[PDB]
Symmetry: D3
């Protein structure tokens, strides 16, 4: 008897590759509308889950929509047949599940900004603005001989990855001891306390947790470079064509030479000065407003507004990711990128 | 011409104006479609999953609850917790309307209803709101009338809108009285019995004499000192906590905790009001009070 | 008797009262010396270094900008960034005056100017401020008059100041209309051409029909729902972002982003007003609109 | 010539066993009304120091009242012959001292929640919601031979507990050194700096303080278990009887099987979800309100409201503690638990 | 029928209404028993332990201080610091009343008292409060009268309460004048001598000419710009700090720091007022000004 | 062709000796008005940069003013010919540069409070209220033999001061390793990550950054002592004379014996209780107000108000410092302390 993938199985897989915990604390991510117990019949990727997207999923026989933008962001106070209420109600009425992979996908090594840089044909793409993850270096003190492996083996048996580090030294030079050390993630602190107490000895078994911060693989934005050095206006025209953008605008001398590019898709104004500090010749983002562009201009910070809507690259990008992850796990569920242009703006 | 949700909403607003609700509150049509024809109305304190099941059972597509099922914004709608109730409503095409603080402050609302169930006399609204009305220079106008009256009166004329403040009919709480003075203990026992309450608790000497009573159903602590100022011998409310009771006791302010759940009286009270309003308008729609006891507490 | 900065400031305040500006805003003489004789006036949207160079070139010692060059307090004044422009003004004895939100809400200001440049009809101020005026008991008085009228009327008399609130002439935005209904797409194209805009974008079906138009130049998102309430078929503003456009789209609210930079129309609009005001007062001072395109954006 | 116990001596003893520093930072604990210099004539324990409690102390010839709840919580703005003013004035006029042992007693291993669990007849009682205490691992580098004990001995002489830990290694492999390490509490950092500077050598004597956090023995609440698995309603009836409560109310299916119990006496709503995470079958507390019970019910979190007033168990509990502490120290001062029922509520 | 604390409180409220005190302030009976018969009244700026000892010595059981001994809530009452003074009061059955900001804004209060001690002329309250009074439709009513007048006038009648705002008699500060113009230096020296101040300091050229003087006793910085607006040549207050003095100096605003402690003049000033009020009411109770110099500063 | 000192060269030198980063985060320090590219013609020191000070610099041919107090503190919203606008405009019009050395000079070992204590003739002067600086102890694990110096040499080549510390031990007792450790300042964390990755080996090169906090040399205030124990009033009269103060006021018994003195020039009320904890017999500051003096008196905290204006000692103090720093660097630029008494107060 089969184990067809349920929403709960999909959630675990999504979380493995694009951890929901990497989303900002203000964000609203994960299963927003649906039922964990339901069997997935197909997956439609979307930037914004508009009414037409829901209609498209229904028409295709798919019961799961993964969007970038959370359809429910601040709590909804009503669910009427109007506005966003009409979309939410239609999902529920048709038993469609909606998952949001929002800022977790913005900060992922394979997420929105890797996807943007790739579509722009750029090279040497690296995450920037790295998160910091908290670890602990756990240090225990134990006598030599057989009580060392006795510790090692039991500790490694009950989890806590089998990489240890051992040094001789004297407690008091009365009691000669071995100081053992290993790493734990911040969540394991509790378990590590338990397991050390259970399989150690004395009246006062000595153990320490030393906070270690490590640079994360996750961060908001990428730095990349063009193949060949280019003028600002030529780089702007190039990416307008590659991303099929109706209108692009840039801030800076049109003949400015550009090699290193920082990209935060969406609305990344607030990071442009830091991007310049980090080595960018231009900061690429959307939703750039007059006074921030004016400020950038006077300071010599070069900008390109590719429009917030250029995050739409994640529909095909995430479709490709998910098909790969499904291949690995030998899952045959169909994934399609929504073909609807959901940009609220029409350009003239 | 069959009554739709939109028509119900108009009628309810007429009799219990949604604008009298507190600004923090979430009232009106919370879940539904205003174009849908009302098949029947079930009244509820809390819209639990059992209450939704009851509406479905009775063939009713409209629930009016006191407490808003969605109060702070919902962050997700999953098949769990409150998500389950909201999803069940939507999937069964049930409309949910909340008449919350607008009902608490209505002259015929929660506190009138409590005082009637207690058999009280001389019941009047306390803690009255203030209505803003302009005298135009002379005749009277309401809040919104101030825009159009310029838009009308400017067809070179010299005119004036004078703000006048009027004590509202609407307010949180009622003051009322027993026929004859009774002890605090006897009054607490009397209302326990009348409201079918499993357990009541009071603050004050059992032999204190009670004539004038202030009532705020739900959770009305914060108002007990004012009530005493307004003439109450006792303040009746729910959800009274230790430190607030201890303060009242030391200050000589008498209280009775009838439990927040005592707002359940609005189910029958609202059923009766709505049957009457329907009668006036010649609407032939069935209204029932939910029979489900939705108190999360069981008393021993 | 030659006009000084102080005299200019008086005249500008007469026609576009600096007190109609928002309380957060920074308006008036921002950089200068009120005793200095005005040699000429250059109007500007943003006072860039190029605009300062232009004033110097033209022999003008007075610039009137819409946008305040100093908005939040300056923490330093170095030869870099905005420091460069402020220092250049001072070192060349150029006076900078900001007519910012007071011009946005003026009956002849930014939004009248936008609606005229679009060739619109029936243009009226929307979002009107409220003026406080007292009726004394009877005759009328203004804001400041309430002090002196006691100081005058107390020379034992029994008197009254009655607060009356009056719809102001001043407000953020105008409502206006085209001669004949046109599609949303055609109207957007029409205004693109009339304002010489490199790129315009709109929200709403291209074949939506437009008759009544609400305009707030600059960055007016926050007001689009109210505008629709006030009768607009479309809200015209700049600096529209994705999520605000997506919200409007789902709610059926039509928008056009003409870009914040479209406030540049106030350069010629202000030049014309100031030439007229000068004429009335028989002041022979040259006024020019800056010809510099100061948009930080270049469009492709 | 005697050393009769003064309030200041009592305060030191109280603080030793139920440290005032473990109280919450918003709390108001310790000597609230009185004179440190005054000789203690007897001690009356109380939940709330009401007028009748003060009258009881006067009648008994006791000049010290220890209450759980602070009679002065937010600053008093007046002291009139009315309300709480009348109680405060009566204490002062009769030279009665009032000490509050509030949230420090809530979080103590022998405090309010241990006492509740014991009165309920429960077993395997353990503190939960543990505080974290900050320590430092101080590391200094010193040459071997005689300068090691020279360091050890002087450091241990000037306090800083004589548990050291020593390891060989090379500074620069030019200057061979011994790295010595030991623990200090967070307050000793200053002294440790001084003492290391004074008895070390070089131009730049190398020493480090490494922050270590340890799970405290103090925490808000206990987890315990019933002897024999029981239904929720039976457990509720049992504890109503054991604590002599006029009325108890519970949230949950009456036949729910209960083994593990979390208890926060007083008003502990806000912790029930965490208690369930920590393994509780039911969260026992007081002052439970409708909407929080409604939420608990829908989420399957089981609750029992034993009333805030059930904290009254600390009068006899603290009396027993204090008599034990006085025995140890050979102090003959009488301690009595106030017999007044001070519950503002009367149940019908 | 001997005067109790409650009767004193009524009389003081009549002449120096406790409701004119700032909302942050702590005034009235701070420590005491309103049923206790007043044996005598000692006036005080600060109620120090020495002032309590003086009351006890004189056989007086009532102290009226300007500064509230309890301002923010007391968190403990131990035999140390301020605890010592509060405990001594209570243990000796001394009643402490605070007439703080209500005395600062009174027409006969701190600032009248300062201006009199300086020998000034044409003294008037500045910074006046606003009194709310309703004209009922016509006759006048006060703040509280608005409730009962409905409760009275509703025995179907159509009526109106019109809010009228009236300049109060009460305000922080006085404006006053010398008989003849004098230099800033000479005026500072004159008031130093008249108030027996060990050290005075002034801001402004020593030869500036002074005629009109604004005074706020205590710590009145924040009001100096307004005072100049109101016509003052100099603002007189205490507790002036470097940066506030430097700002005033650069703006041409003249100041004199007479020290916060100069509010001590209210001891004799209040003694005189209270003897007079007692006379009117035929109360034979002794009132003395405390003779203790309570300044924490000693000057060298 | 010369390298005459420009403002940018002066800024670097100032920052070296009195780091701008030690200023409070609310403060406004450094070059407030001027041009980094301009050649310095002479330096005038000032407490407050008043109009007369600017006039004095012009008259002397000096184009640089260093003040203690920042002429621009909260952003200026206008620059009119009035008030502070007139001073700012006059600086700009005459090409005068103004640097503020504000709270950085308050907390410097040679700054305002050292200068105050020295002018008072005091001894044993020590900074108090020390800042804490964040460092990292970087720990890497590397095999013995030749890969150790290979690491050492390259790491030391690319900066990161050549003080290392080495200990033997076993990774897994499979792979025997050397644990190397060294210090970095908090800014080097990024570089250290790079350089370790570049010149280390494995699939997972193990390195840790351990946060170390050290007591700074910078702090607000000094503690010092009088030569000979003195009465409070005599100490007050002495310092009034030494600093030429028109009027001094003190709080405390006039015959109180004084040996240890805490000094925060300016407006240091808020620190007096801590100063007493730290061992002061009197707290010396300016701008003392009635209610704070009243509080101090009742608590037995002794105060002397020497007036905020007594910070004027830094004009000659900083002149002396700067002349010394210029000597070292062989710079011939004139430095003069402004002679203008800029006290807004005149005493009578
Ligand atoms: Zn994104
Ligand atoms: Zn986005
Ligand atoms: Zn209610
Ligand atoms: Zn309720
Ligand atoms: Zn504008
Ligand atoms: Zn603008
Ligand atoms: Zn407790
Ligand atoms: Zn409690
Ligand atoms: Zn005062
Ligand atoms: Zn005062
Ligand atoms: Zn300073
Ligand atoms: Zn200073």
């Amino acid at each position: 008897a089969m184990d067809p993938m349920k929403i709960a199985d999909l959630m675990t897989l999504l979380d493995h590759h694009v951890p929901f915990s990497t989303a900002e604390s203000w964000d609203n991510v994960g299963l927003l509308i649906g039922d964990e117990d339901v069997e997935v019949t197909g997956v439609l990727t979307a930037l914004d889950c508009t009414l037409e997207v829901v209609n498209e999923a229904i028409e295709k026989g798919y019961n799961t929509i993964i969007s970038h933008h959370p359809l429910i962001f601040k709590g909804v106070t009503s669910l009427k047949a109007n506005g966003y209420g009409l979309i939410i109600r239609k999902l529920i009425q048709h038993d469609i599940n909606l998952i949001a992979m929002h800022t977790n996908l913005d900060v992922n090594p394979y997420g929105v900004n890797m996807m943007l840089a790739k579509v722009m044909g750029l090279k040497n793409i690296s995450i920037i603005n790295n998160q910091q993850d908290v670890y602990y270096k756990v240090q225990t003190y134990i006598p030599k001989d057989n009580v060392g492996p006795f510790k090692d083996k039991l500790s490694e048996n009950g989890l806590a990855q089998e990489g240890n580090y051992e040094y001789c030294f004297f407690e008091s030079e009365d009691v000669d001891e071995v100081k053992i050390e290993f790493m734990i993630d911040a969540y394991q602190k509790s378990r590590a306390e338990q397991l050390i107490k259970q399989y150690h000895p004395y009246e006062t078994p000595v153990f320490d947790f030393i906070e270690i911060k490590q640079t994360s693989l996750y961060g908001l934005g990428v730095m990349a470079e063009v193949d060949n050095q280019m003028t600002l206006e030529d780089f702007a025209a190039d990416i307008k064509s590659k991303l099929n953008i109706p209108s692009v605008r840039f801030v800076g001398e049109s003949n400015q030479k550009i090699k290193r590019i920082a990209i935060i898709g969406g609305s990344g104004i607030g990071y442009e000065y830091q991007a310049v500090q980090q080595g960018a010749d231009v900061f690429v983002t959307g939703d750039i407003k007059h006074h921030d562009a004016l400020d950038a201009k006077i300071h010599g910070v070069n900008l390109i507004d590719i429009n917030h809507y250029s995050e739409y690259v994640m529909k095909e990008g995430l479709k490709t990711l998910l098909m790969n992850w499904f291949n690995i796990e030998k899952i045959n569920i169909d994934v399609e990128a929504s073909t609807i242009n959901t940009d609220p703006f029409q350009y003239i």
